[PDB]
Amino acid sequence: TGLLDGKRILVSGIITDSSIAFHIARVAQEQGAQLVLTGFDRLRLIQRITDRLPAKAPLLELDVQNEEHLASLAGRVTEAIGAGNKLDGVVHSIGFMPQTGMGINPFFDAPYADVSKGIHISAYSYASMAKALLPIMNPGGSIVGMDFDPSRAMPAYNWMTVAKSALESVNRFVAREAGKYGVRSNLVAAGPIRTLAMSAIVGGALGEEAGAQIQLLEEGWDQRAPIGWNMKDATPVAKTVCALLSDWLPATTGDIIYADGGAHTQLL
Amino acid sequence: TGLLDGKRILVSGIITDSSIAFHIARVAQEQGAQLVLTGFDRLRLIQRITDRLPAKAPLLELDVQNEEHLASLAGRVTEAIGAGNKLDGVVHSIGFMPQTGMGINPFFDAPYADVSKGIHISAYSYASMAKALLPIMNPGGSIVGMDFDPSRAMPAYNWMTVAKSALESVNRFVAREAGKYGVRSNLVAAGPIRTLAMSAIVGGALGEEAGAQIQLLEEGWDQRAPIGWNMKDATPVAKTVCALLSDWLPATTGDIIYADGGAHTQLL
Amino acid sequence: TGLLDGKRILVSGIITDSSIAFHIARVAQEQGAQLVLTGFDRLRLIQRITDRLPAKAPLLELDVQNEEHLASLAGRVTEAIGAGNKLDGVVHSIGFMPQTGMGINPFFDAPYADVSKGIHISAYSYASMAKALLPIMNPGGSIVGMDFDPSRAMPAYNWMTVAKSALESVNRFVAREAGKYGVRSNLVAAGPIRTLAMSAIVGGALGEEAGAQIQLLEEGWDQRAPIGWNMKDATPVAKTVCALLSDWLPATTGDIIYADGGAHTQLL
Amino acid sequence: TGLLDGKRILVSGIITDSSIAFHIARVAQEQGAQLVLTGFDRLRLIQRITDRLPAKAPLLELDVQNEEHLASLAGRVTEAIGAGNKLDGVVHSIGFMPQTGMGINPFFDAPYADVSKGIHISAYSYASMAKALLPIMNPGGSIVGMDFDPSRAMPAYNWMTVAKSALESVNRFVAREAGKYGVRSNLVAAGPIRTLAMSAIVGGALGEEAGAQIQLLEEGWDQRAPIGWNMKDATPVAKTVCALLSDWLPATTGDIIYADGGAHTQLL
Ligand SMILES: NC(=O)c1ccc[n+]([C@@H]2O[C@H](COP(=O)([O-])OP(=O)(O)OC[C@H]3O[C@@H](n4cnc5c(N)ncnc54)[C@H](O)[C@@H]3O)[C@@H](O)[C@H]2O)c1
Ligand SMILES: NC(=O)c1ccc[n+]([C@@H]2O[C@H](COP(=O)([O-])OP(=O)(O)OC[C@H]3O[C@@H](n4cnc5c(N)ncnc54)[C@H](O)[C@@H]3O)[C@@H](O)[C@H]2O)c1
Ligand SMILES: NC(=O)c1ccc[n+]([C@@H]2O[C@H](COP(=O)([O-])OP(=O)(O)OC[C@H]3O[C@@H](n4cnc5c(N)ncnc54)[C@H](O)[C@@H]3O)[C@@H](O)[C@H]2O)c1
Ligand SMILES: NC(=O)c1ccc[n+]([C@@H]2O[C@H](COP(=O)([O-])OP(=O)(O)OC[C@H]3O[C@@H](n4cnc5c(N)ncnc54)[C@H](O)[C@@H]3O)[C@@H](O)[C@H]2O)c1
Ligand SMILES: CCCCCCc1ccc(Oc2ccc(Oc3cccc(O)n3)cc2)c(O)c1
Ligand SMILES: CCCCCCc1ccc(Oc2ccc(Oc3cccc(O)n3)cc2)c(O)c1
Ligand SMILES: CCCCCCc1ccc(Oc2ccc(Oc3cccc(O)n3)cc2)c(O)c1
Ligand SMILES: CCCCCCc1ccc(Oc2ccc(Oc3cccc(O)n3)cc2)c(O)c1
Ligand SMILES: [Cl-]
Ligand SMILES: [Cl-]
Ligand SMILES: [Cl-]
Ligand SMILES: [Cl-]
């Protein structure tokens, strides 16, 4: 009856109840999956969030820049799900770009050290999670990451755009590796959803030129989307991720599914 | 329990048991849908095929070049499904290109009259089916057509490539109209499957230069696909169509989902 | 000293002094080319226009839907340029879509007969001009057509969008044929320029919903273009065409060069 | 008479006589430009190369990871070209990826520190060269970088593919900044040319599985290219760069011109 009945799925990237990952975890549980959750840094605060999910799920610590956490991750997961059991799904819902690389800060003023950190967390980590977790994934399994279409430049998103372009490229290579295990790798390119991350970008630009341009982006998304776009509601995005975690897109890999109201298909 | 439990879905394009449409219809029925089927020209022969589906379904006549059949289609469907009921899904699985526009015939030697017929049936008909059927579609509904990625030229496919490029463009406009009804429109770009149509192209090129090149295309698809590609098996394609007919890709429209083993994401 | 010194170039599509073709012809002549011009239907009126070019050039009649004109074209050109001489360049700057397929007329209300005419003139003719003219083209030669980026749907452009999508596909196949003669084939995707054609679309939508949307398209082009966009000035487009007619893009074929101020590379 | 008569152009990336930059510099000089050259690390060896250019040109030191070299670059250039003179063109022809990120080394085994270095030199440096040099560029000017189409994954190129995907994204943002100065920014996506860099990749894979796959890539390029592809000959690529440095692509920015024999437009 549930789309993900019987599946064991790791979900990274819960930080608040608004997190795309929170809604992915919620719909997944609603659809019969057994979750393992990972969180970064503020674990006590994240546990308060995860308590509001429909079911209990273990929360493991994962800083994707921490080599020890990556090296121990498989064993920690196996310990949570029981020896002899493997994962069927992995969700990377993780991003970061130091403030110099996003927002009102001029593009040319982001030092490489900041850019490099953002690319580590937002792009390279997709590879390093796959490297850690493919060895405990079942054939038929699915790795999904989150993307924002970086095909064209835009105001404010700046070096995160560059990180997403790298992420898309990384995904195409992770698919080559994943396929050796019978595993798909794909991204969901979402339209804008009011998360802590989105709020940070918007809020940090209020009152500035970039904020005027972000306003235009926000207005235009729903306008261009043939079926509309509601920026409050992560459910449609979460459902799409669940579709890729299911067995119903079995010939799709190294690819990008756009959960954006169809906006990217319309010039206006 | 079924992905399409309760849904009423029209499926065009069954000609043999190998038809992508046959497998779409089969998986849809397996997943709890109630079908209405359309067939072109050889209706007595098609009925012998549809008898082998898991359940009985009415077969209506539809030649997409026939204006009377298009004008009467909604009423004929409503009569099959019962007054007061509407469709939730529509599958366009239809193509044709006169032999001068595909295969070994030189590209420049296809007269426009032949090209125009192929584009009518393979591209424009996506619009005219949508125009006929949106008025009897429920909000939440889904229109899916079948595509073969025409982003790059290739041997033999010739003017059908041109028809598919037009089809992708048509789909983006059908989505604008469909969205007024709460309806999604999308294509599934499939990898090669041995259907009557594919056999016709391959067979018509055996022993010729183009056949050597088609051989390379066939070999290369499974090689490039990170998860492989089996040209016998339409099931993975049919499942993808069913995914788009479901409620699990609710923010995707005017778009293309690639059910091709990930081949299009890999240069080699 | 001139980019096209010594080259013989056919230029189709002059109808008014504002025609993209007029400016292509003008810059080409400025750059040392010897032109042969083709015109459709209103030849006496077109001659009044071509008299304003910097040099005299013969004007031949070509209706691309007329099979006799296509069959006689090579011989007529050879007669204009002298036996023993061939063309180095061909410019297709031709488009048409019956009024039912563009503007305020609903997308679904364009009958196929109208759509088919538009695709004949706007897309298939690129192939049929190449078929007629490659036999009198020198190795090193160049065929260029005019495109408007149809990657995404948009208001009003409607079935012309579909014709342009087909044109891009046709160009990729013309390149395969052209390469047998040492000849490149490419499109220039221009931003909007106030021509008779553009005026017709804009004017036919004044006072209607579509006209409000065209206004947004016009405003947005210059805004998104990092170097700006001036819709009066065809020169930048004409220069780009001349670049492809030159020897300075010798490894580019089956491709699209965007002369649009960079707009297509920017979401906003 | 020369395409670049009167223009002052900086050209980075000469390491051997086979360097794409060497041929860019050579054709540019042939076409009347005045060059300033930058080299990395092996300056005495590079000077032996640059002595073989058609004219003398000053060679400045630039390690793009060195912040002092970047901070002093404009002043050093101005000193070479004379106070009161500015650049009209800048060529970034620079790449590097530590050996763990390219070749036979498994994709997942490249540590981020190596990946980060490759992205610094191959992608971020496009921004930091633009940031250093736009302040001494004339309106009408042109910045060009070198790309290898990273739209699809492939054997061996691995993390350099990821760097190129980031580079394309960076270019789209550099165009927004450059446009404030009346300056275009674009990449040329070249087909494969036997340079020190290409030889390193090919040579490092000889005798291994990846080398078999590179062989297929090499064979397939000329096959798919409608006009062919000669991997010895950088001239066609160099000419394309010169086209973008000229005034003949005046409405193209944030974009990519493919100097690849048209291969990327053909599936096979
Ligand atoms: N919200 C949108 O509009 C939108 C649109 C498209 C794509 N996305 C993508 O969705 C994903 C989730 O973002 P969100 O909008 O839900 O925001 P969010 O702020 O809720 O989530 C971001 C997450 O990244 C995690 N993270 C940061 N550094 C980390 C590290 N070192 N190790 C592990 N995790 C780390 C944070 O802990 C947090 O859980 C991101 O990849 C984002 O780019 C968001
Ligand atoms: N088989 C593949 O490898 C492949 C790959 C990608 C996409 N596709 C697409 O899938 C769709 C189905 O093709 P298939 O491979 O199952 O072949 P098929 O030969 O089984 O189906 C083609 C169908 O088109 C129908 N058709 C033709 N003219 C018609 C008309 N005038 N009115 C109505 N229907 C008409 C035929 O009756 C037939 O049912 C097509 O759009 C095809 O281009 C096929
Ligand atoms: N103006 C723009 O903004 C713009 C933008 C992008 C692309 N384009 C393309 O540029 C090309 C030229 O259009 P334009 O804007 O200069 O308009 P225009 O109205 O000046 O030119 C259109 C031309 O098409 C010709 N034509 C129509 N039917 C013909 C037939 N049967 N045979 C031969 N020629 C025929 C007309 O005679 C006319 O010369 C077209 O392909 C158009 O789609 C224009
Ligand atoms: N050769 C091909 O087939 C091909 C194809 C497409 C694109 N390209 C691109 O062309 C460009 C030139 O490469 P090439 O093939 O001529 O190779 P090459 O080995 O001749 O040039 C590479 C250059 O990068 C320079 N470089 C490396 N680290 C540097 C640093 N820290 N600071 C400054 N310069 C540094 C080297 O000094 C060298 O001059 C690269 O961007 C490459 O990716 C090459
Ligand atoms: C700039 C246009 C506004 C619409 C942006 C849509 C969007 C919104 C949120 C997105 O998700 C993240 C996630 C993490 C992220 O990195 C962050 C988050 C907070 C602070 C910080 O320094 N980096 C940036 C964006 C995202 O990838 C895309
Ligand atoms: C030329 C490369 C071989 C792989 C082609 C993959 C493919 C195989 C079959 C496809 O489906 C159709 C359906 C109808 C069609 O039109 C036909 C079919 C039979 C005869 C005829 O004249 N036209 C052509 C292809 C399709 O769209 C794509
Ligand atoms: C709808 C958005 C407005 C911007 C459109 C930019 C554009 C403007 C003009 C273009 O050129 C043509 C050329 C012929 C053409 O067909 C015509 C022209 C006049 C009347 C008619 O029926 N068809 C349509 C557009 C073109 O291809 C694109
Ligand atoms: C893997 C398929 C073989 C065809 C690759 C075509 C290609 C050949 C050469 C290319 O240029 C570079 C330039 C620098 C570069 O970084 C290098 C060069 C030498 C050693 C090293 O560690 N990194 C890698 C490639 C390039 O970007 C693309
Ligand atoms: Cl904590
Ligand atoms: Cl833990
Ligand atoms: Cl640990
Ligand atoms: Cl909202």
Ligand SMILES: [Cl-]
């Ligand atoms: Cl939803």
Ligand SMILES: [Cl-]
């Ligand atoms: Cl019958």
Ligand SMILES: [Cl-]
């Ligand atoms: Cl019937």
Ligand SMILES: [Cl-]
């Ligand atoms: Cl009827």
Ligand SMILES: [Cl-]
């Ligand atoms: Cl097979």
Ligand SMILES: [Cl-]
């Ligand atoms: Cl399957």
Ligand SMILES: [Cl-]
């Ligand atoms: Cl007349």
Ligand SMILES: [Cl-]
């Ligand atoms: Cl005549």
Ligand SMILES: [Cl-]
């Ligand atoms: Cl005649």
Ligand SMILES: [Cl-]
């Ligand atoms: Cl204007």
Ligand SMILES: [Cl-]
């Ligand atoms: Cl100009």
Ligand SMILES: [Cl-]
């Ligand atoms: Cl030295």
Ligand SMILES: [Cl-]
């Ligand atoms: Cl120096």
Ligand SMILES: [Cl-]
């Ligand atoms: Cl210094």
Ligand SMILES: [Cl-]
């Ligand atoms: Cl060679």
Ligand SMILES: [Cl-]
């Ligand atoms: Cl050349």
